[PDB]
Write a protein that binds this ligand. Structure first.
Ligand SMILES: [Mg+2]
Ligand SMILES: [Mg+2]
Ligand SMILES: [Zn+2]
Lengths: 100, 199, 143, 145, 67, 49, 137, 63, 70
RNA sequence: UAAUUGCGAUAACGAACGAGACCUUAACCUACUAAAUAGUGGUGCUAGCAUUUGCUGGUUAUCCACUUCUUAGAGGGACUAUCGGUUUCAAGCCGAUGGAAGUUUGAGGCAAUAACAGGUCUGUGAUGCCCUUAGACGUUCUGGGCCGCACGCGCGCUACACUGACGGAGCCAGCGAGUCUAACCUUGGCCGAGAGGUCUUGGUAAUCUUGUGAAACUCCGUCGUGCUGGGGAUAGAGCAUUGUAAUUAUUGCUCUUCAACGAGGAAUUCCUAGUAAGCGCAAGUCAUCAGCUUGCGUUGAUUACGUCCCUGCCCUUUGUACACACC
């Protein structure tokens, strides 16, 4: 069996947590050893801009936010479990990177 | 008294804090009493403090300022002139130096000297725009006395050889003795001079 | 009774190690003294030309003792202050790199610091010995 | 600190390189009054002269003053770097000078004069009296009097 | 100020109107029962409803309340 | 028929409207500050505070 | 056994263990806190309860994250909370309450962290509430 | 400078153009069975002690 | 440099009989009472502290508090 | 009541929007889950000082245990709770206790109906109409200008100094950003007085830059109250960096010159608590260029807890010869 690490990145917190719980459940159902899902903190990609498309009026600024939450979950599993765990989490919105 | 030691040695000049009657590390707080009866409950001594740097909330309510140590109120009012906004460490060092200089010149318990200066320089009657002669509340009396003392020390120390600490010391000494050479006493005398001419 | 550099904090140890480096006679001075400002963000050279390099060396040695390996850039950032840019707002400016690098090389030649496997200079065994001796001497001479 | 009796042996404002130098100021800042030497240059020359900088300009000696003058007039010779000089590779001989006299004004006038003689834009701006370093003239430096 | 809006007051009134042999004059049990007998869509609003219900039943025991 | 445009405001343009001014280059959007307001929700930038 | 203190952003984690009266703040003794004027702010949680009072406990602090004054207050709260926690966990609830009385009766945020946080800055002026200078003509 | 102290037993209300003055019912410490109405500039509450130069001046509202 | 620059010794007995009429001594006290200039007040205080009549109150920089010998 | 928020009253009844509710964030939680991308201890290995074994340090694949700090998921927590007083009968209000937090808990985001001849045709391959369309008003290339200076005005930066300047020494943040078609954030070594150069390195990032060793600040010294060692405008000379290209100086660095300015007239701005003010930092624009802005944190006051006097706003009553609505 191989050492693997699954890195999950998303703006959708519900989808991210659903995928992380799916991975944890699929690990515990086969009784594998895993270092629990570590939550890499939300990168708030703040962007401040001017509301007006011109230069008139009260100088009102406007901040937009893009919250990038990250999870990482590393465990040990054979090639069959590795392939089925990378092919069980295709939830729309979560980026999944599996490294050996 | 009780010269016990521990692994990190902290000196007996610190260990003598509370074995006897409580005090600040140089000036006692029990031998301080305001020379009047109206400025009680608005000049705050006893409780005592080891340093006039209580980073405490005192402005979210109306009369909570009266519970702030009067030495710290003097420090906060020294914490002014714009260039010196902030610099509370500077202001508390100035207060320490001022207290030492007060004790050097006619020692008289420099905390007690500060209290006497405030009580003497609190204007009792002032004028309001309607002018009309009105009385002054004790809280405003304390606030105006502190403001006058600090401002006098500030503009005395401005552009002259003596430091802010010693200018404040002279101002507090003269105000406590009630002499007309202190700026705060002169200003309070002017405010009370136009109190009777506007009745 | 088990006294380290962390028992005298900021000025007594620094002045005593500067005095020790002065009396040891080993100067390691680059000849830049009297000429340099120690930072582009300064306005004047050090006031005491004889001994400012020794205080710098003592400070660098203590700074490398108190933590792990420290480099020339870290020392530059540490010793650089704000610069009066005229009618422009102040800003942090890094200190002189050559002075810090030559201080590091001087303490290397004396054997107080050594090159780290991970970069920068880490205090040497003899460096700790000398610094601990100075700390104990300062403590036993003046509380 | 010591005996400073010196009943008749203190120099009040004195003469140095055709410039009045106050004897009541510490040596370096007293010397900074000469046109061509500033704080850093005076500090460097006073440390090269082996003079005690902690004393006023009026009591040091009558000969180490001339030593400072010699060091000041010959900086590159007394172990002073070229980058410490106000006149490097000046315009016509490449030597490193330090104009320290009532001659820094002369050299400045020579530079301005050569610029306007060759009709360079800086020289023309100097002739008009306007700002020369690309500054905005719309709002600042109006009265100047 | 701390004036409760109609969204709070009417809901507390209805909760008392059909749950008197029920949650006592203690806010803790009032909110715990509100969780079960009302689909409030925020804990802040639920706490508001429970507190106003507690106050209303506390003043009920001094006599009937109009409405 | 061309002079260098490897830097400055003429090197890059809005990926939507091709405007050289008011460009937002943070995170590599390269989108005008007005076009970004028009289609910020699509990219995933929201307002919270 | 493990406690912490905060004032604005400085957190000081204190370990209170069984030992013999050793009070360290950053590896140095508490005599070495170095504001040089607020060094009694870090002595205050000692001089209130008992001057020596201790051949039994060792306090070792580590503070990071704020400023000089904020770190001073953070460690002064941390060691007080550590002493209270040690007395609650090991010695007795009576003593824990009895010295909590002194700490809270003289309270300068010794046991309760100050809730004042920097209010966010708004556009149209530097600072949270200060606005840029407005002109009319 | 005759000395006469009083204690505000009741705060009547704000007065003055800007509302800077508080009108208060005050009761003298000596001869406690007598009350006069006064105008105060600073912040004042009940059970507070005023020092007044002139003892008898029935203060009215300030327009 | 306006006054009391380097000598302050024509009346050097004012370093012995200066104790009366004042218990407070400082840099600005020396400058103000027509004896010693601020350019060497900081070293005259050190002289009198090392040997003389003044006793320190604290080791403060940017300030100096001295008292007469008791 | 902050509120057309409610108690109520009642030719209205029952509703809708807005307010509130809501969402984000900042406070606490020794509660759960889980962490060599966060951390802390007990053993290992292990330099120093002290030797009854302690102190501080080291050990980025060296051991185990844990989650207080940190992180972020699911939740808890406050609801003005309790207790008094005041409340026309109530909505509420005022104190004290408890509480992490009692002002809508702090800050925001969102935010109605009607409008304005408000701004934007120079954001748009949004656009009607008009003009132009091959000596073009399309587009591109070189050069210049947008910055140009008798003067007036607005936003600001730096100061007028000792509550300071300058030298050493102490050495504390938080919000963030960063390059695989490639040159971004750069540690470390070396050279240089500096700016900077060079040889490597880590990082596509809780991993490295970076603990962003920030500045104000603190300590100790020099200066000594004078346009001074305050102030740094103007100018001269040189050294570099970015760029195809620095002249009208892009900027940085060194030396020199060292102006006004001695706290500012009439006027006038912003602001109530971690706020004002001071202090710097990151991001944006960016090849280079902050005295700008957007945020962030560090130090941290005074004063008030009111009023309708000024300037305005909301509701009611009232008068009008106003309706472009008192300009
Ligand atoms: Mg323009
Ligand atoms: Mg008219
Ligand atoms: Zn666009």
């Amino acid at each position: 069996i191989i050492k693997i690490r699954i890195t999950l990145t998303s703006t959708k917190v519900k989808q991210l947590e659903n995928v992380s719980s799916n991975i944890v459940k699929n690990a515990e159902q086969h009784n594998l050893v895993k270092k629990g899902p570590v939550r890499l903190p939300t990168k708030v990609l703040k962007i401040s801009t001017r509301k007006t498309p011109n230069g008139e009026g009260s100088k009102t600024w406007e901040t937009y936010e893009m919250r990038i939450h990250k999870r990482y979950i590393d465990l040990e599993a054979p090639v069959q479990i590795v392939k089925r765990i990378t092919q069980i989490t295709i939830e729309p919105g979560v980026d999944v990177e599996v490294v050996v | 008294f009780t010269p016990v030691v521990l692994a990190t040695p902290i000196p007996e000049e610190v260990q003598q804090a509370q074995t006897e009657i409580k005090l600040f590390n140089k000036w006692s707080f029990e031998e301080v009493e305001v020379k009047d009866a109206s400025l009680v409950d608005y000049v705050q001594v006893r409780q005592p403090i080891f340093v006039a740097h209580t980073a405490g909330r005192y402005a979210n309510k109306r009369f909570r300022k009266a519970q702030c140590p009067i030495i710290e109120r003097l420090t906060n009012s020294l914490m002014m002139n714009g260039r010196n906004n902030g610099k509370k460490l500077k202001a508390v060092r100035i207060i320490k130096h001022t207290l030492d200089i007060i004790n050097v010149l006619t020692d008289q318990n420099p905390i007690q000297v500060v209290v006497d200066a405030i009580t003497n320089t609190g204007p009792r009657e002032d004028t309001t725009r309607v002018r009309q002669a009105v009385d002054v509340s004790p809280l405003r009396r304390v606030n105006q006395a502190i403001a006058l003392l600090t401002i006098g020390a500030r503009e005395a120390a401005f552009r002259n050889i003596k430091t802010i600490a010693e200018t404040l010391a002279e101002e507090l000494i003269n105000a406590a003795k009630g002499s007309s050479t202190s700026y705060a006493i002169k200003k309070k005398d002017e405010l009370e001079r136009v109190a009777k001419s506007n009745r | 009774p088990g006294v380290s550099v962390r028992d005298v904090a900021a000025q007594d140890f620094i002045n005593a190690y500067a005095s020790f480096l002065q009396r040891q006679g080993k100067l390691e001075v680059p000849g830049y003294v009297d000429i340099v400002k120690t930072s582009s963000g300064n306005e004047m050279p050090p006031q005491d030309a004889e001994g400012w390099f020794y205080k710098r060396a003592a400070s660098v040695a203590r700074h490398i003792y108190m933590r792990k390996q420290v480099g020339v850039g870290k020392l530059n950032k540490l010793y650089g202050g704000a610069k009066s840019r005229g009618v422009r707002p102040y800003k942090h400016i890094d200190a002189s790199g050559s002075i810090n690098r030559k201080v590091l090389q001087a303490l290397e030649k004396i054997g107080i610091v050594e090159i780290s496997p991970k970069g920068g200079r880490r205090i040497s065994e003899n460096g700790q010995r000398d610094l601990d001796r100075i700390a104990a001497q300062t403590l036993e001479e003046d509380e | 600190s010591l005996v400073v009796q010196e009943q008749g042996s203190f120099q009040h404002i004195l003469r140095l390189l055709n410039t009045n130098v106050d004897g009541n100021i510490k040596i370096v800042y007293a010397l900074t009054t000469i046109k061509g030497v500033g704080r850093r240059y005076s500090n460097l020359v006073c440390k090269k002269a082996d003079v005690d900088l902690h004393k006023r300009a009026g009591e040091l000696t009558q000969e180490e003053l001339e030593r400072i003058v010699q060091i000041m007039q010959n900086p590159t010779h007394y172990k002073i770097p070229a980058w410490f000089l106000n006149r490097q590779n000046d315009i016509t001989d490449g030597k490193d000078y330090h104009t320290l006299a009532n001659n820094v004004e002369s050299k400045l006038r020579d530079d301005l004069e050569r610029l306007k003689k060759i009709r360079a834009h800086r020289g023309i701006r100097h002739f008009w009296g306007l700002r020369v370093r690309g500054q905005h003239t719309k709002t600042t430096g109006r009265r100047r009097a | 100020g701390r004036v409760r809006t109609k969204t709070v007051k009417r809901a507390s009134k209805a909760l008392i109107e059909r749950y008197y042999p029920k949650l006592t004059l203690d806010f803790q049990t009032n909110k715990r029962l509100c969780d079960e007998i009302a689909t409030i869509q925020s804990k802040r609003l639920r706490n508001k409803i429970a507190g106003y219900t507690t106050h209303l039943m506390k003043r009920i025991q001094k006599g009937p309340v109009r409405g | 028929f061309s002079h260098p445009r490897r830097y400055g405001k003429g090197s890059r343009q809005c990926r939507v409207c091709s405007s050289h001014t008011g460009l937002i280059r943070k995170y590599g959007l390269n989108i005008c500050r007005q076009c970004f307001r028009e289609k910020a929700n699509d990219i995933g930038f929201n307002k919270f505070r | 056994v493990q406690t912490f203190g905060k004032k604005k952003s400085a957190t000081a984690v204190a370990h209170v263990k069984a030992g013999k009266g050793l009070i360290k703040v950053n590896g140095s003794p508490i005599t070495l806190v170095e504001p040089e004027i607020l060094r009694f702010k870090v002595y205050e949680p000692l001089l209130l309860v008992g001057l020596d009072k201790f051949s039994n406990i060792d306090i070792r602090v580590r503070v990071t994250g704020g400023g000089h004054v904020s770190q001073v207050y953070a460690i002064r709260q941390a060691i007080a909370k550590g002493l209270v926690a040690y007395h609650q966990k090991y010695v007795d609830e009576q003593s824990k309450n009895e010295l909590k009385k002194a700490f809270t009766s003289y309270d300068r945020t010794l046991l309760i962290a100050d809730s004042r946080r920097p209010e966010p800055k708004k556009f149209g002026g530097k600072g949270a509430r200060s606005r840029f200078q407005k002109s009319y003509r | 400078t005759p000395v006469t102290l009083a204690k505000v037993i009741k705060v009547l209300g704000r007065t003055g153009s800007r509302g800077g003055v508080t009108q208060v019912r005050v009761e003298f410490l000596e001869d406690t069975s007598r009350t006069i109405v006064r105008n105060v500039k600073g912040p004042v509450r009940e059970n507070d002690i005023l020092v007044l130069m002139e003892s008898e001046r029935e203060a009215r509202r300030l327009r | 440099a306006q006054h009391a620059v380097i000598l302050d010794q024509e009346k050097y007995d004012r370093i012995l009989k200066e104790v009366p009429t004042y218990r407070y001594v400082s840099v600005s006290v020396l400058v103000d009472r027509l004896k010693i200039g601020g350019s060497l007040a900081r070293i005259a205080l050190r002289h009198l502290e090392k040997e003389g009549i003044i006793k320190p109150i604290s080791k403060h920089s940017k300030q100096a508090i001295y008292t007469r010998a008791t």
